[PDB]
């Protein structure tokens, strides 16, 4: 919904004045690095499903009480529900880093993630640790170049790290 261009537009409309020149220079920097947004989104959407399985792998090696009967992730239906939750969480991370604004992820996950997880009985700790490990693996596959022309990517690293910590403190 809200893009960083539309973020600047909404600030300039709340002020009701024309946009400042230095903010337009910041937007010139943004459109200069839009190809690196493309590089990162393409890279992690290439490997996304394997990242989801590896995150569930580390989660289920870490906490065997979830696989254990009576656990919340025990049943086959609930296991598919778990992988559904992680897949759509990584999907909204990809949405947010494609848009550049966290408003998509916030306005479509922050609202009811905690709510569903306390209402169902879902332990929010496991989802928080899982989205943290998934974010570490996502930075790991994004940052290292494999046959890719070299450049700096620290701002993007900061951006997806912020997106995954907003997810982590969303579910808690």
């Amino acid at each position: 919904m809200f893009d960083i261009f539309t973020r600047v537009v909404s600030q300039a409309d709340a002020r009701g004045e024309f946009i400042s020149s230095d903010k337009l220079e910041a937007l010139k920097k943004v459109v200069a690095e839009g190809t690196k947004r493309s590089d990162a989104v393409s890279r992690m959407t290439n490997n996304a499903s394997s990242i989801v399985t590896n995150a569930a792998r580390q989660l289920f090696a870490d906490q065997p009480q979830l696989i254990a009967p009576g656990g919340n992730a025990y049943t086959n239906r609930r296991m598919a529900a778990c992988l559904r939750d992680m897949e759509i969480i990584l999907r909204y991370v990809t949405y947010a880093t494609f848009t550049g604004d966290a408003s998509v992820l916030n306005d479509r996950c922050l609202n009811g993630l905690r709510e569903t997880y306390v209402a169902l009985g879902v332990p929010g700790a496991s989802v928080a640790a899982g989205v943290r490990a998934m974010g570490k693996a996502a930075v790991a596959i994004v940052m290292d170049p494999a046959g890719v022309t070299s450049g700096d990517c620290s701002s993007l690293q900061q951006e997806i790290e912020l997106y995954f910590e907003t997810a982590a403190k969303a579910v808690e």
Partner: protein, 289 residues
């Protein structure tokens, strides 16, 4: 499809697969689908035979008129106006039409402008048509299937919000939709424009803190500002909500249902104090830190 504490959330009664009208249905199968349409569109409100609209119903029993058009027929009817359009607030009427026809809770403030704007521009007769003539309508149940609550499944296109807003909308199975705790007032219209959700509560007996409702004046946000910097305790904080406080009496307690914010270290002692007041706990959700 919940299956863990499904008793606790009341959605265990809505477990079954939806009803499907066959190509050549019998008369009894017709009557079952008519009873399902009456129960869903009027929200488990039972109907008298004087308000049965048997004439519009017989046309459906022929098969010349589809099930979805029968849903249109009961919503076009004057009894639905008298039960729902007339007593309720018009924003609340939009809220009810989201449950009755689409089967889910509204997601944002944009849908409540679109239906209010449409109400002023063209009437309730046109507004109902706009609910039923929707892609979101026609995907989930095109012509044959009854409306039914789809919010408990993600259905590839639910925002998170509608799951938890639905439990403010409907209680249980036994509860009739005309008849709720708040009555005339609309639960979700406060929630929509602040873009916030209240905690999920299940319906009664299975849960005994059902009585708790958030005050309209006091929002009481979930997070409580800083993992309790101001409460001055090192541990994380959970939200606690109490249903009644009746033991304390009138000069001691001005309002029965209140929200406390506690660290976990003092959680046990406050819970014991609440039980000493005879107060039963509605919800407890982790608040901050």
């Amino acid at each position: 499809p919940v299956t863990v504490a499904a008793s606790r959330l009341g959605t265990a009664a809505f477990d079954q697969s939806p009803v499907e009208l066959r190509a050549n249905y019998s008369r009894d199968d017709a009557q079952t689908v008519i009873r399902a349409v009456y129960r869903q569109v009027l929200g488990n409100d039972y109907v008298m035979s004087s308000e049965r609209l048997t004439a519009a119903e017989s046309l459906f029993t022929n098969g010349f008129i589809s099930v979805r058009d029968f849903v249109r027929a009961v919503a076009q009817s004057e009894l639905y106006k008298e039960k729902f359009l007339y007593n309720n607030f018009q924003t609340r009427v939009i809220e009810l039409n989201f449950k009755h026809l689409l089967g889910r809770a509204p997601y944002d403030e944009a849908e409540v402008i679109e239906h209010l704007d449409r109400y002023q521009n063209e009437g309730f007769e046109a507004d109902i048509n706009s609910y039923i003539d929707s892609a979101e309508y026609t995907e989930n149940f095109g012509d044959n299937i009854v409306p039914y609550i789809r919010s408990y499944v993600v259905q590839t296109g639910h925002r998170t919000v509608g799951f938890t807003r639905m439990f403010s909308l409907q209680r249980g199975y036994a509860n009739s939709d005309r008849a709720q705790i708040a009555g005339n007032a609309s639960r979700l219209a406060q929630e929509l424009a602040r873009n916030t959700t209240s905690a999920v509560v299940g319906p009664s007996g299975v849960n005994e803190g059902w009585a708790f409702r958030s005050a309209a004046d006091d929002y009481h946000p979930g997070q409580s500002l800083g993992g309790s910097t101001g409460l001055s305790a090192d541990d994380q904080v959970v939200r606690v909500e109490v249903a009644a406080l009746s033991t304390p009496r009138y000069p001691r307690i001005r309002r029965s249902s209140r929200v406390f914010f506690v660290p976990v270290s003092r959680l046990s002692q406050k819970l014991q104090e609440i039980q000493r007041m005879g107060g039963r706990v509605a919800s407890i959700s982790p608040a901050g830190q």
